[PDB]
Amino acid sequence: HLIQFGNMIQCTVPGFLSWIKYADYGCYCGAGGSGTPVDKLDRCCQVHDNCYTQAQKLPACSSIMDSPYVKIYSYDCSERTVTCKADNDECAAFICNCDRVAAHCFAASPYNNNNYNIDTTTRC
Ligand SMILES: [Ca+2]
């Protein structure tokens, strides 16, 4: 669930920026995505998008399109590290890993303010 994804971000990069700073960034962090990723962080989002597209195709998710957005999974946070618990079913587990990888990718990427809330219909 997107709400959990938000908490993961709070897990890997504590006390830096609010969730909204990674919700509308570059050509990929935020509704839809197209063009070339403006930077490494944007690149994290591009992969996350694909991951979500893969979840919708994954047989384990029964073709329920909104699965990666609302499906509730089980994860853990400790020492700024996120892990997906084993008590997750196939679909939930895949979605959890999509977010897990993204959260860690964000934390390992520099944040460029000039790429926040940009005009996608010009830079993408
Ligand atoms: Ca997107």
From Swiss-Prot:
Expressed by the venom gland. It is found in: Secreted. It catalyses: a 1,2-diacyl-sn-glycero-3-phosphocholine + H2O = a 1-acyl-sn-glycero-3-phosphocholine + a fatty acid + H(+). Keywords: Calcium, Cardiotoxin, Disulfide bond, Hemostasis impairing toxin, Hydrolase, Lipid degradation, Lipid metabolism, Metal-binding, Myotoxin, Platelet aggregation inhibiting toxin, Secreted, Signal, Toxin. Its cofactor is Ca(2+). Coiled coil: none annotated. It comes from the Eukaryota. Its main location: secreted. Ca(2+) binds at residues 28, 30, 32, 49. Its EC number is 3.1.1.4. One of its GO terms (cellular component) is extracellular region. GO terms for biological process: arachidonate secretion; fatty acid biosynthetic process; lipid catabolic process; phospholipid metabolic process; positive regulation of fibroblast proliferation. It is an enzyme of class 3 (hydrolase). The active site is at 48, 99. Disulfide bonds join 11-77, 27-124, 29-45, 44-105, 51-98, 61-91, 84-96. Binds 1 Ca(2+) ion. GO terms for molecular function: calcium ion binding; calcium-dependent phospholipase A2 activity; phospholipid binding; signaling receptor binding; toxin activity. Snake venom phospholipase A2 (PLA2) that may exhibit cardiotoxicity, myotoxicity, antiplatelet activity, and edema-inducing activity. PLA2 catalyzes the calcium-dependent hydrolysis of the 2-acyl groups in 3-sn-phosphoglycerides. Belongs to the phospholipase A2 family. Group I subfamily. D49 sub-subfamily. This is Acidic phospholipase A2 1. It comes from Ophiophagus hannah (King cobra). The chain holds residues 28 to 151 of 151 of the full protein.
